[PDB]
Design a binder for these strands. Structure first.
Ligand SMILES: [Mg+2]
Ligand SMILES: [Mg+2]
Ligand SMILES: [Mg+2]
Ligand SMILES: [Mg+2]
Ligand SMILES: [Mg+2]
Ligand SMILES: [Mg+2]
Ligand SMILES: [Mg+2]
Ligand SMILES: [Mg+2]
Ligand SMILES: [Mg+2]
Ligand SMILES: [Mg+2]
Ligand SMILES: [Mg+2]
Ligand SMILES: [Mg+2]
Ligand SMILES: [Mg+2]
Ligand SMILES: [Mg+2]
Ligand SMILES: [Mg+2]
Ligand SMILES: [Mg+2]
Ligand SMILES: [Mg+2]
Ligand SMILES: [Mg+2]
Ligand SMILES: [Mg+2]
Ligand SMILES: [Mg+2]
Ligand SMILES: [Mg+2]
Ligand SMILES: [Mg+2]
Ligand SMILES: [Mg+2]
Ligand SMILES: [Mg+2]
Ligand SMILES: [Mg+2]
Ligand SMILES: [Mg+2]
Ligand SMILES: [Mg+2]
Ligand SMILES: [Mg+2]
Ligand SMILES: [Mg+2]
Ligand SMILES: [Mg+2]
Ligand SMILES: [Mg+2]
Ligand SMILES: [Mg+2]
Ligand SMILES: [Mg+2]
Ligand SMILES: [Mg+2]
Ligand SMILES: [Mg+2]
Ligand SMILES: [Mg+2]
Ligand SMILES: [Mg+2]
Ligand SMILES: [Mg+2]
Ligand SMILES: [Mg+2]
Ligand SMILES: [Mg+2]
Ligand SMILES: [Mg+2]
Ligand SMILES: [Mg+2]
Ligand SMILES: [Mg+2]
Ligand SMILES: [Mg+2]
Ligand SMILES: [Mg+2]
Ligand SMILES: [Mg+2]
Ligand SMILES: [Mg+2]
Ligand SMILES: [Mg+2]
Ligand SMILES: [Mg+2]
Ligand SMILES: [Mg+2]
Ligand SMILES: [Mg+2]
Ligand SMILES: [Mg+2]
Ligand SMILES: [Mg+2]
Ligand SMILES: [Mg+2]
Ligand SMILES: [Mg+2]
Ligand SMILES: [Mg+2]
Ligand SMILES: [Mg+2]
Ligand SMILES: [Mg+2]
Ligand SMILES: [Mg+2]
Ligand SMILES: [Mg+2]
Ligand SMILES: [Mg+2]
Ligand SMILES: [Mg+2]
Ligand SMILES: [Mg+2]
Ligand SMILES: [Mg+2]
Ligand SMILES: [Mg+2]
Ligand SMILES: [Mg+2]
Ligand SMILES: [Mg+2]
Ligand SMILES: [Mg+2]
Ligand SMILES: [Mg+2]
Ligand SMILES: [Mg+2]
Ligand SMILES: [Mg+2]
Ligand SMILES: [Mg+2]
Ligand SMILES: [Mg+2]
Ligand SMILES: [Mg+2]
Ligand SMILES: [Mg+2]
Ligand SMILES: [Mg+2]
Ligand SMILES: [Mg+2]
Ligand SMILES: [Mg+2]
Ligand SMILES: [Mg+2]
Ligand SMILES: [Mg+2]
Ligand SMILES: [Mg+2]
Ligand SMILES: [Mg+2]
Ligand SMILES: [Mg+2]
Ligand SMILES: [Mg+2]
Ligand SMILES: [Mg+2]
Ligand SMILES: [Mg+2]
Ligand SMILES: [Mg+2]
Ligand SMILES: [Mg+2]
Ligand SMILES: [Mg+2]
Ligand SMILES: [Mg+2]
Ligand SMILES: [Mg+2]
Ligand SMILES: [Mg+2]
Lengths: 99, 84, 63, 50
RNA sequence: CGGGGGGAACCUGGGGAACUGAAACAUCUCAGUACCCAGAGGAGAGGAAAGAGAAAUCGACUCCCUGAGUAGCGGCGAGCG
RNA sequence: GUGGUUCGUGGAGCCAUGGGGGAAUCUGGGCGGACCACCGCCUAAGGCUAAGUACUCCGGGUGACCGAUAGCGCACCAGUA
RNA sequence: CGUAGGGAAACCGAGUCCGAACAGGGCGCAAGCGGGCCGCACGCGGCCCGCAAAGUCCGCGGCCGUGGACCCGAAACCGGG
RNA sequence: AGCUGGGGCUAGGAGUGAAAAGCUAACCGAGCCCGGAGAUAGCUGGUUCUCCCCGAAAUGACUUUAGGGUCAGCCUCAGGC
RNA sequence: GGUGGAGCCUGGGAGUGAGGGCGCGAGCGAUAACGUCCGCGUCCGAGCGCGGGAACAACCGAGACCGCCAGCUAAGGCCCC
RNA sequence: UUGCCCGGUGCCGGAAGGUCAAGGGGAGGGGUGCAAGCCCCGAACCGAAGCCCCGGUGAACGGCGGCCGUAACUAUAACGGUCCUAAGGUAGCGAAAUUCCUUGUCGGGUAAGUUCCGACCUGCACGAAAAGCGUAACGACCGGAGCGCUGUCUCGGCGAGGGACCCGGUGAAAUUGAACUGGCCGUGAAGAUGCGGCCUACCCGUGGCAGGACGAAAAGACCCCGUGGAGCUUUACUGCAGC
RNA sequence: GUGAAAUACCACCCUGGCGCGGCUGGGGGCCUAACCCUCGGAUGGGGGGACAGCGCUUGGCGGGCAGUUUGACUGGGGCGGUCGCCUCCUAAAAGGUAACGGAGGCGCCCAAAGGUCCCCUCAGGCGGGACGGAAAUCCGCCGGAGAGCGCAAGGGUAGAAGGGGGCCUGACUGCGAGGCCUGCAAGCCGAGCAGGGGCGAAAGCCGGGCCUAGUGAACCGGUGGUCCCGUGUGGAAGGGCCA
């Protein structure tokens, strides 16, 4: 560029760039497909997932994604519809938590 | 130094080139939508399997081959016989 | 020192999974008064090329 | 355009819009017309200003 | 009884530019930088919550690493942070 | 009316304050980013306080630092002639 | 940093966004093995393998950004004397 | 309205000027020194050992652009087809 | 048909964005200019390396890896120089 | 002696009116509270200089162009008319430090005068205080003429002294790619000692001349370019002091 | 009778004015004691006086001063001209193609000049014709397009895009296979599906206009909706998204 208007002829879409106090302390959820979850057994839970090789401090746990659900209990903050289905083949659903 | 007053003009403005003309010649395979001809008036009438746009813009609507046809005082055409 | 994220970019482009750069079509901000629905309708994001290569270089750190 | 003036078309059954141009002087004043909505679709629309 | 001056940098306070950058330029930048002045000392400053801000939370201040080029600021420009 | 903070008037709070008006003493008063109601946090208008941190005129120890056009401006009677 | 992409967002999730729509369409995903060996189920498990699915870390090199940024050169601007 | 010695005062956007923008320590349309400072310089100049392979451009679009640039065209290297 | 320092795809590094002469097709000019502006081509540029043209970037010949006290040619020449 | 024009700008004066700040005032409306409330928005209207406006003012900034008609040839116009502006040069001067056409045209001076002096007035574009017109005296100011006298010149000559020249002594400089550095026609980036062809030409100095080495000196002061710089101006922009 | 309009009487009100009174503003006058100035030094005496001075805040004037801006092209530069878009030529029979080359247009417009259904066919030439130009409108032949199509030019066109009449609003919403053009982003053509409609018996046609000019990225804000976010919570303020 130099002189003429650069591809800045574009246009902020990103509706919402932020007020002045800043970002709003909101709870973030990180998905983790049961696919990976089927790497170990027992009773998988957050922390045990971060310490593993996924998630890590990224807040609330949300299992889902593809992969074949393994017959065992899985504790999460959320579960996807089709994930909850997959745990049909004998699994768990200790949702909610956070108390 | 001689630079006596220099006259002036005006009629020094033109229009943008529109790149009109036939975009696909007979024998060429074309998919539906391919805008064959792109004239201004009706230089080329729409033939079988052909569509005319706002600007007489001829466009094929059938996946097949192309081909023209002179009908004399009936005006030329350009139908896209289907790959049957 | 630590390169800086161009916020003017960070505000008009969402960088995709394959690496492509995406932004909203230009036109319908006020132009109008009477444009075909087709025109005013046909405005919902798009590609860019050789130029986004440049874009991506300004969005460094925020990957 | 000074005389034409561009106005919009409200759903009268509520809100909505479409917008076109008029021509106050030339055979005109107050625009009523059949337009298909989005918030239910199938009604009559009047002018307005914006 | 004390005070006065001197001291390379360092430190706090009181004042405080411009070239530059924005490929012109005035808001913006350079920068509370350079510099002037006063003061203090082996350091100076800061310091025990009329705090932080969302956590049934922490618990003086200073200093380092992260947080983060984030959140945000900006002729939403340069850039600042 | 301004300064400080990421905040350039912004929905502009918070901390300082030149001007004007001008309280109350915990049945008080400040804060949690306009404002209001809830729920909370904290006690302004008095002072002091080691350590961790900064610097290097000076002394020492090191160098994939220099080796007299280099290295400090000065290896020499140089801030001299 | 990497292992989820979408949305302006709430949010949903191998999907997601526009849409009334299982119409469409924009971003998205869908990764084994050339293959020696061998427990020696007439089964290839899976050890192994390139370095991937696929990334990271460190070294080296090219170019880019911020810095004086290849070296020498203004006319000038500003501060204190 | 003279000339002259000695002693004094006024200075940098300031002085002084029977006025030329004159004079202010041998170049004054803004003194000199040191500092910001390696100001900036889209301009000029210069850019240091050897061999081997390939090898351009001086066009287009836009440009407070026109001896400068961004994308494309043309060159080269790696990988793939 | 065509195995070529042909093509195509992805990526790293560019430089170049003052061109010039000749031929031909147009404009301008005054069918003047070693003029000017486009179009194709070609050379110079970067082949100021070699032969011819007396000399001479771009006209005719011809694309210089090195060596030879051998040979055939090109343009142009074959009276002396 | 210093005319005419106060429209516009400036300055002075001005209690009709137009517009205009903070502030005042709050019809009316809003956010939340269960409420008292606590926060805001906000129409009338009241709110200074200022500008506008009205009058004045020229030894305040300034302006004084033109166009028609008109007298016993012709010309001219004392006389009338006209206007976008406010009005259209009173005296005196005038081819002038001002005249483009221009060596204007007459006259003077000269054998001959683009200058000069005196006139005419078609003043491209004088004019009253950035003054008009004069003026004795004064001036290292600029013009034109005479007398005198001359080496200024016709048109040169000789003489002198100080250098220049030579010897002993002493001993620089700018400049300098290297040089074995000639003429003519050509040719070449258009002006070659260096290419071509030809011509001329033994080697090295010394006193002289200045045509060439696009001679030396100064990175052209003219010209253009740079989104370079400064000084200066204003009814350019934006601020500031001051009032 | 006059007039536009009628008067006794009765009211509801309007215009403007004068009084007395609340609300709010101006400007004088007198005082001394703050401040200021003065008296042979004064806890005092004179004079000015809540003005002036000085603090904060409003608006004004403001080259006295400060920082800057004053475009490019261009047969040098300046002066003049030009700068985006459309048509034709130059352009060498694809596309593209320059010059301060040649010649003209645009910065709109239309609710019917749009959609659909049904009818209709021109200009001129020659006759014959009341006012009738050499074209008003008629009648008769002859006439494939020279007429018409809002406006430049070109292309196109009556087997209608032209001329008339009826219902209508598709000048739709959600999309969009596949392409033209192209450095970038822009421009352009668009079948087809869905929702809900228009006209036609139906086949069908309708996502403005015979076509190519009638235009403007971003940023900053306004107005409707959205309910997406909303700083401990709820709501607000303020944003976002769609228009
Ligand atoms: Mg169509
Ligand atoms: Mg839409
Ligand atoms: Mg990060
Ligand atoms: Mg002491
Ligand atoms: Mg300090
Ligand atoms: Mg300080
Ligand atoms: Mg300080
Ligand atoms: Mg600055
Ligand atoms: Mg700048
Ligand atoms: Mg700062
Ligand atoms: Mg110590
Ligand atoms: Mg201490
Ligand atoms: Mg210590
Ligand atoms: Mg305490
Ligand atoms: Mg501030
Ligand atoms: Mg503030
Ligand atoms: Mg205060
Ligand atoms: Mg106060
Ligand atoms: Mg407080
Ligand atoms: Mg407070
Ligand atoms: Mg508070
Ligand atoms: Mg708080
Ligand atoms: Mg809060
Ligand atoms: Mg607290
Ligand atoms: Mg305390
Ligand atoms: Mg205390
Ligand atoms: Mg302390
Ligand atoms: Mg202390
Ligand atoms: Mg230390
Ligand atoms: Mg030394
Ligand atoms: Mg030595
Ligand atoms: Mg030393
Ligand atoms: Mg030295
Ligand atoms: Mg999809
Ligand atoms: Mg340098
Ligand atoms: Mg000074
Ligand atoms: Mg004296
Ligand atoms: Mg100065
Ligand atoms: Mg100074
Ligand atoms: Mg003075
Ligand atoms: Mg004097
Ligand atoms: Mg002076
Ligand atoms: Mg001097
Ligand atoms: Mg200066
Ligand atoms: Mg600096
Ligand atoms: Mg320098
Ligand atoms: Mg430099
Ligand atoms: Mg540059
Ligand atoms: Mg080669
Ligand atoms: Mg390039
Ligand atoms: Mg290869
Ligand atoms: Mg090649
Ligand atoms: Mg490449
Ligand atoms: Mg060029
Ligand atoms: Mg050229
Ligand atoms: Mg050129
Ligand atoms: Mg060429
Ligand atoms: Mg050329
Ligand atoms: Mg050529
Ligand atoms: Mg020619
Ligand atoms: Mg030429
Ligand atoms: Mg020629
Ligand atoms: Mg050219
Ligand atoms: Mg070549
Ligand atoms: Mg050659
Ligand atoms: Mg040569
Ligand atoms: Mg040759
Ligand atoms: Mg030869
Ligand atoms: Mg070869
Ligand atoms: Mg032979
Ligand atoms: Mg032969
Ligand atoms: Mg209320
Ligand atoms: Mg004199
Ligand atoms: Mg002699
Ligand atoms: Mg001698
Ligand atoms: Mg010659
Ligand atoms: Mg010779
Ligand atoms: Mg030789
Ligand atoms: Mg000699
Ligand atoms: Mg001589
Ligand atoms: Mg000479
Ligand atoms: Mg007294
Ligand atoms: Mg008294
Ligand atoms: Mg008194
Ligand atoms: Mg007062
Ligand atoms: Mg100035
Ligand atoms: Mg500056
Ligand atoms: Mg063509
Ligand atoms: Mg051709
Ligand atoms: Mg109709
Ligand atoms: Mg495109
Ligand atoms: Mg809240």
């Amino acid at each position: 560029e130099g002189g003429r208007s650069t591809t800045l002829m574009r246009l902020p879409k990103r509706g919402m760039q932020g007020q002045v106090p800043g970002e709003i302390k909101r709870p973030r959820y990180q998905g983790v497909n049961l696919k990976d979850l089927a790497r170990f057994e027992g009773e998988v839970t957050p922390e045990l997932l971060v310490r593993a090789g996924l998630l890590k401090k990224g807040y609330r746990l949300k299992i889902l994604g593809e992969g074949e659900a393994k017959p065992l209990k899985v504790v999460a903050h959320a579960f996807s519809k089709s994930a909850l289905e997959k745990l049909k083949a004998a699994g768990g659903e200790p949702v909610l938590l956070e108390a | 130094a001689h630079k006596k007053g220099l006259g002036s003009t005006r009629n020094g403005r033109d229009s943008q080139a529109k790149r009109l003309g036939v975009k696909r010649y007979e024998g060429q395979v074309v998919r539906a939508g391919n805008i064959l001809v792109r004239q201004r008036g009706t230089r080329f009438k729409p033939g079988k399997n052909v569509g005319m746009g706002r600007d007489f813009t001829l466009f094929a609507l059938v996946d097949g081959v192309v081909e023209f046809q002179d009908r004399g005082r009936l005006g030329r055409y350009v139908h896209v016989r289907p790959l049957a | 020192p630590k390169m800086k994220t161009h916020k003017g970019a960070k505000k008009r482009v969402k960088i995709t999974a394959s690496g492509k750069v995406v932004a909203m079509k230009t036109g319908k901000r006020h132009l109008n008064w009477q444009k075909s629905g087709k025109e005013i309708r046909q405005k919902g994001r798009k590609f860019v090329l050789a130029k986004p290569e440049a874009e991506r270089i300004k969005l460094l750190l925020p990957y | 355009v000074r005389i034409k003036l561009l106005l919009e078309c409200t759903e009268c059954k509520r809100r909505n819009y479409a917008t076109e141009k008029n021509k106050r002087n030339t055979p005109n004043k107050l625009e009523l017309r059949k337009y298909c909505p989005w918030c239910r679709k199938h009604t009559v629309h009047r002018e307005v200003k914006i």
